[PDB]
RNA sequence: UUUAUUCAUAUAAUUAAUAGGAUAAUAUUUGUAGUUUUUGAUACCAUGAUAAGGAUUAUAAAUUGAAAGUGUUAAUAUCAU
């Protein structure tokens, strides 16, 4: 659903959701806006399959099979869906033949426990 | 003669109530339950400030340093069920 994309937000009008507003937890804004987005489906299958971000996991996937672990690291900072679990495939063989163990496992606790597990795979 | 405030005459602004999200043994969920919502008692109480007069202690040349407590009359005045 391309067209369908987007979340509309409030105007805090009345008294008691300026106190609701002046109540809020630390994570309020992104929190709603994390769990109003992208999320488990009816059927059982991840929110993996977004139009708009597509060419991004493409791009992410491309640059870790080259060897570029910096850079899709630093466009995996840009990502605002969950990202397919072929984006921590790549970007852990990216990590194998340098040895870096801390930014794999690192890589795999990013997605393990927060994104619906993509990278317990 | 210009300006900081003061004053004149033109103005915009209006209402109400909660809602927990990763590492938690299973509720999909939140424009939903609210409508004739609250901002509505400035009074004639017997307050309190002002001025004025009293007494006690120093018999040491030491100490950085011989300084501190206790009582009465006039006028003015008193807006809270």
């Known amino acids: 659903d391309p067209n369908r994309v987007g979340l509309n937000a409030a105007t805090l009008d009345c008294r008691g959701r300026i106190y609701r507003w002046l109540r809020r937890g630390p994570f309020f804004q992104v929190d709603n806006y994390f769990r109003r987005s992208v999320k488990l489906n009816r059927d059982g299958t991840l929110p993996t399959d977004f139009v708009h971000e597509a060419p991004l996991m493409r791009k992410i996937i491309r640059l870790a099979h080259r060897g570029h672990l910096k850079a899709a690291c630093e466009e995996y900072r840009r990502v605002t869906t969950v990202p397919p679990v072929?984006?921590?495939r790549a970007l852990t063989a990216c990590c194998v033949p340098?040895?870096?163990?801390?930014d794999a496992v690192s890589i795999f606790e990013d997605g393990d426990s927060k994104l619906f597990y993509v990278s317990r795979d």
């Open 98 to 102: 340098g040895a870096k163990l801390a």
């Open 86 to 88: 072929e984006v921590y």
